[PDB]
Design a protein around this ligand. Structure first.
Ligand code: S3P
Ligand code: GPF
Length: 427
């Protein structure tokens, strides 16, 4: 199969203008599609996950145009819930936010639509969301394994009292929050217990407000939504740079800088992953905050032991950065790594051991003890963009590393390797 071999990188230094945020991009596209008016999105991400959402919108009859580099999109709002019949199949690759958000949104009114995706997507849980949508009146059928896509949506979500489990994915709540305002009746969403990946809920509420809708958040335990609302185009909207994609570059500087500045995100960003910079600071790196940039300058790198539930994606970057840190690093409260693009706890532990680390794969945590020196390995990437990007950091040592299926980074960052190369210096 395909592979890419990265030669040792002596130093990293420079500036990266970040690709658009995948999380903001897919929420903005869906809200723009449901809204009244024309929305112009700029700095939109061009990647597999966004392409599947754009394809779904096209299939649902939404009109839009894209610039040559696919980062500017003019969307003609539908002025209300999207609709299609005939069990129209929407293929969503392995795009979780698209699958979860559309599963809820397409429950508005009547419809007959099937959502499916790649084999791994049929193994990613969605039962907590289906349970919630059904309490609200939706008719949903599992076409294969119970609690997983593919789903056949036949509409009927009207609102009411809806409980939702937030212990496995915040995306279920996010999906409900964006959908509920357009339901005819008022909705009270009650979180059953724990809520993971909480910062993503703030991204959702931020986007909803931009598109003209606010709800009552009662300490993230219950959300009160007024039905019969409408989303409104915000005119021109600037998609923030992706803070998760930025992690690789900031970590690279913490390990082998130099100073690396990423632009497109700053101290005012709505993304929880900018908090990744805080972790690098705690490990010993120096961080600079700007209005439209965050930079990291090499200092030292010490092992840390922390709960990473607030930055599950960027946390993977700390797992490979740990190979360069003094001491044993422990990342805790990250059980849902197991239900994402791949089981990330198993995958990360397996590949880290290949370059020499001693690793304890905990049920919901990972403990990493770096080797005195890294060795060469051919890294398996599990159709997971982040395994490829995280392990690219192994090359910031004296050993090269071979990354299998490097194009898997296209899920959220097609140009990843060229960008890492841009800040890679020989001197
Ligand atoms: O809402 C979002 O944009 C996302 C929420 C997270 O998922 P979980 O809530 O399942 O942790 C994250 O891992 C994913 O990449 C994007
Ligand atoms: O981007 C990541 O690291 C994980 N994504 C999970 P999603 O497919 O967006 O639900």
């Amino acid at each position: 199969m395909e592979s890419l071999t990265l030669q040792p990188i002596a130093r990293v230094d420079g500036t990266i203008n970040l690709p658009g945020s995948k999380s903001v991009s897919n929420r903005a596209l869906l809200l723009a599609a449901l809204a009244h008016g024309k929305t112009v999105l700029t700095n939109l991400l061009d990647s597999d996950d966004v392409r599947h959402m754009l394809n779904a919108l096209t299939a649902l009859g939404v009109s839009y145009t894209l610039s040559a580099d696919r980062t500017r999109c003019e969307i003609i709002g539908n002025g209300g819930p999207l609709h299609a019949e005939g069990a129209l199949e929407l293929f969503l690759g392995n795009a979780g936010i698209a699958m979860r958000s559309l599963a809820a949104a397409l429950c508005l009114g009547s419809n007959d639509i099937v959502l499916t995706g790649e084999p791994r997507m049929k193994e990613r849980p969605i039962g907590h969301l289906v349970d919630a949508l059904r309490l609200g009146g939706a008719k949903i059928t599992y076409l294969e394994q119970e609690n997983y896509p593919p789903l056949r949506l036949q509409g009927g979500f009207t609102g009411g009292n809806v409980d939702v489990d937030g212990s496995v994915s915040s995306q279920f709540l996010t999906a409900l929050l964006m959908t509920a305002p357009l339901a005819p009746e008022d909705t009270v969403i009650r979180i059953k217990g724990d809520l993971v990946s909480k910062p993503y809920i703030d991204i959702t509420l931020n986007l909803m407000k931009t598109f003209g809708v606010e709800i009552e958040n009662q300490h993230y335990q219950q959300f009160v939504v007024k039905g019969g609302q409408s989303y409104q185009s915000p005119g021109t909207y600037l998609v923030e740079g992706d803070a998760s994609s930025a992690s690789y570059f900031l970590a690279a500087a913490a390990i082998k800088g130099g100073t690396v500045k990423v632009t497109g995100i700053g101290r005012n960003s709505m993304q929880g992953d900018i908090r990744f910079a805080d972790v690098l600071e705690k490990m010993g790196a120096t961080i600079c905050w700007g209005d439209d940039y965050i930079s990291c300058t090499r200092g030292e790198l010490n092992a840390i032991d922390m709960d990473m539930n607030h930055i599950p994606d960027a946390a993977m970057t700390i797992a490979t950065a740990a190979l360069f840190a003094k001491g044993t690093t422990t990342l805790r409260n990250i059980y849902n790594w197991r239900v994402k693009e791949t089981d990330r706890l198993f995958a990360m532990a397996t590949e880290l051991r290949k370059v020499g680390a001693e690793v304890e794969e905990g049920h919901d945590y990972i403990r990493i003890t770096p080797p005195e020196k890294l060795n060469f390995a051919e890294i398996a990437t599990y159709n997971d963009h982040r395994m490829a990007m995280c392990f690219s950091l192994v090359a910031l040592s004296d050993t090269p590393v071979t990354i299998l299926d490097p194009k898997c980074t296209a899920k959220t960052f097609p140009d990843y390797f060229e960008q890492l190369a841009r800040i890679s210096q020989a001197a």
